[PDB]
Symmetry: C2
Subunit: 209 residues, 2 copies
Amino acid sequence: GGPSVFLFPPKPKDTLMISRTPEVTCVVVDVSHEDPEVKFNWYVDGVEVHNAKTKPREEQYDSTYRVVSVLTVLHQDWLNGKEYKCKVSNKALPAPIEKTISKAKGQPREPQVYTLPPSREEMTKNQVSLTCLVKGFYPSDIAVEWESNGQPENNYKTTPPVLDSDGSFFLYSKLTVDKSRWQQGNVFSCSVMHEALHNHYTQKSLSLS
Amino acid sequence: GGPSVFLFPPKPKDTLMISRTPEVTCVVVDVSHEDPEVKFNWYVDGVEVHNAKTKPREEQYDSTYRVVSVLTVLHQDWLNGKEYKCKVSNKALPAPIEKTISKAKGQPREPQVYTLPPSREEMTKNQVSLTCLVKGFYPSDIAVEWESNGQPENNYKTTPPVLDSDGSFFLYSKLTVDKSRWQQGNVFSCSVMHEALHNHYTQKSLSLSP
């Protein structure tokens, strides 16, 4: 019946592209209305840093408080495997709560990416499903997307990562499209982002090949 | 730190094929070495059953002992959505713990099964990947298996079910075979089992074209 801490890692795409801003997020929920102050302490690989920011309190419609501190991290810092220790302390907790996080420990492995067109059998339907297999990559932090003529493809679900026989991972990403398009000749591309790829980005094509 | 329960549901294959026996299982972990006394009360839709059965606990190697009681349920009683309630009770525990499982509710839906050959760009490897798309099914309970002429293929992995946009589930299974076996012909079949499938079973072949 006190505060609980949650520490989330940066978004897969955020660490892979310098363009992006990789952030680490520490959340503090159930902060006694009585004593609503939270003190965050950030340690990068043991060393305490300070450039963290804390987004304003938010009355947890049950009068408790929700407090969040966001720490910007350097890409090559997270990819190089440093640990992020977020120490949260509050006037109502004996000792502070600590939660550390980091990139999965393991030798990175490049993801082969193959595109597979819809089954003839599936053509009886009006909607068709395009398949993008992405096997043999480590760690599992990866981003898979679809686009057609530049513009991104909306309708698509990706199966979570699955641990393959050889310590590696893999998954599929199913982009659904009006058969109409698939038959016309439109071209769709599956793009994959992961640190073990050249430029952290490969892109494979798929159409009425 | 005390006794808790983990009520598990039957394996998807067991509820579909009569030949086998589907069973609901009730685990009880953290049974204080002090008091290992555990009673098991099973009730199927209110009614209580006595055909239950408790598995001889084993020392979990850290004071605590875990106790499991398996109850064999009838295929249709589960497929028809009957609830199964497990009532664990121990001297060193406030009130009796309770857990109840039951098949997901909703109109079952027949899974669409497609087999997709390995990619050409993938033919530059020692081994290739055979894909089996199983989409549009509900409830997510399902079993997917591979095989080739009698002997079942035992080097495949299947992603877990994924909630599709239309409220139904879909998965992809991946069978890895030595590129050789693939070109030399040899057909492979992806067998899918679900309550919505006629006879609870279907299977698509898949082999090299010319």
